[PDB]
Design a protein around this ligand. Structure first.
Ligand SMILES: CCCCCCCCCCCC[N+](C)(C)[O-]
Length: 131
């Protein structure tokens, strides 16, 4: 949805270390991931949505159509397959690798994007402010 377009800067994080832990990210990569303060730029060209994530330590970018699975190499270097869908103020991603699955749900809240990330029992919340 065009609702999500813009540039969003991280202003808060809760439980990200434990989230990366649960995904099997190693200590040394985790230390960088916890110092990152990323910017997420969401753009759209026709029906192809691009989410670019920029930081001092790693940049990533995915382009996709809603509801169509796509291959992805993640920031921590998992070779994954993901699908993004749209439901009423939320863009929801399921990301799979091996027999494993994690969810990343981006929800809009008055000028902010609240992102809930879940891997088994671990819940992480990252808040971005439109800028
Ligand atoms: C050669 C560069 C290696 C250093 C990469 C540092 C970035 C680690 C960020 C981990 C992010 C975890 N993830 C994908 C779930 O968001």
């Amino acid at each position: 949805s065009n609702k999500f377009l813009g540039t969003w800067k991280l202003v808060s994080s809760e439980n990200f270390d434990d989230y990366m832990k649960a995904l099997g990210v190693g200590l040394a990569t985790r230390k960088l991931g916890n110092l990152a303060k990323p910017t997420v730029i969401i753009s759209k060209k026709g029906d192809v949505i691009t989410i670019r994530t920029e930081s001092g330590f790693k940049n990533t970018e995915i382009s996709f159509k809603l509801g169509q699975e796509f291959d992805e190499t993640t920031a921590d270097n998992r070779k994954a397959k993901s699908t993004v869908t749209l439901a009423a103020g939320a863009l929801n991603q399921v990301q799979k690798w091996n027999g494993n699955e994690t969810t990343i749900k981006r929800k809009l809240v008055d000028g902010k994007m609240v992102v809930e990330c879940k891997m088994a029992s671990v819940v992480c919340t990252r808040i971005y402010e439109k800028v």
